[PDB]
Design a binder for this molecule. Structure first.
Ligand SMILES: CN(C)CCCOc1cc2c(cc1O)c1c3c(c(-c4ccccc4Cl)cc1n2C)C(=O)NC3=O
Ligand SMILES: [Cl-]
Length: 250
């Protein structure tokens, strides 16, 4: 098998994803091995197609190769040795020491540049959340292109409900880029030290009214006001990724 022959498997890093050394080049890669799926195959192939047009950007995880063997599909991507934002947030949570305002702005700006790049390729990510942001200056890179779709798709697989804009839940796909913007604000909120976001119920709905969850630290008004517009109930009111990256607060 290509996998066994080309790569030395170092360890499992996600449940599968493995940290591997490619034997010829001496580099370390993250390789996802999933069972080969149909509508499910189309969804698997969009991940690959997305990766293969989104390999030029410093804030999107680099793709190297993908292949099929057995009943598995394989994707070999850039290894980010800092883990995901989810783990850094969860460690912060235990130590009661969060991203400070300067680091939240950096997080927001870097990921915002990633979205800006995705969105200019007429693509939307649709699953922005801390577990899909990888850490390599710390560098943040968007990864997990499993929900990537073209921006005017009439059908969307919705991402994690914690980060899901209401209009996407209502199957209104008229402004899909602003769904990524909404999820990015909530991502930054979690990095700021917020409690686990709700999945349904009255707290879920409340955020989708444009009320920011409680943040256990004091932030500038100007920064809080940017995060809050990013979760505006009206997606049109939310900044584009380009407007976000040029924003004076950043
Ligand atoms: C506790 N923590 C500090 C480190 C332990 C786990 O570390 C990692 C897990 C990881 C990745 C990188 C890591 O450093 C990691 C990467 C990636 C993926 C991934 C997600 C979706 C599709 C394909 C892949 Cl390879 C999934 C990944 N997982 C589950 C990736 O593309 N590039 C990555 O570095
Ligand atoms: Cl997450």
């Amino acid at each position: 098998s290509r996998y066994t022959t080309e790569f030395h498997e170092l360890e499992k890093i996600g449940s599968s994803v493995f940290k591997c050394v490619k034997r010829l080049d001496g580099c370390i890669y993250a390789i996802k091995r999933s069972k080969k799926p149909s509508v499910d195959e189309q969804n698997a192939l969009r991940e690959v197609y997305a990766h293969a047009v989104l390999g030029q950007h410093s804030h999107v995880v680099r793709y190297f190769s993908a292949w099929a063997e057995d009943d598995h599909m394989l994707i070999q991507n850039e290894y980010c040795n800092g883990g995901s934002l989810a783990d850094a947030i969860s460690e912060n949570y235990r130590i009661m020491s969060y991203f400070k305002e300067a680091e939240l702005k950096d997080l927001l700006l870097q990921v915002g540049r990633g979205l800006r790049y995705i969105h200019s390729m007429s693509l939307v990510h649709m699953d922005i959340k801390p577990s899909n942001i990888f850490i390599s200056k710390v560098m943040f890179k968007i990864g997990d292109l499993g929900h990537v779709t073209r921006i005017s798709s009439p059908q969307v697989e919705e991402g994690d409900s914690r980060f899901l804009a209401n209009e996407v839940l209502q199957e209104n796909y008229t402004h899909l880029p602003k769904a990524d913007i909404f999820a990015l604000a909530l991502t930054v909120v979690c990095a700021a030290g917020a409690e686990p976001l709700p999945r349904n119920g009255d707290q879920w709905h409340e955020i989708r009214q444009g009320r920011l969850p409680r943040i256990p630290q004091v932030l500038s008004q100007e920064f809080t006001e940017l995060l809050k517009v990013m979760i505006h109930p009206d997606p049109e009111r939310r900044p584009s990724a380009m407007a976000l990256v040029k924003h004076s607060v950043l």
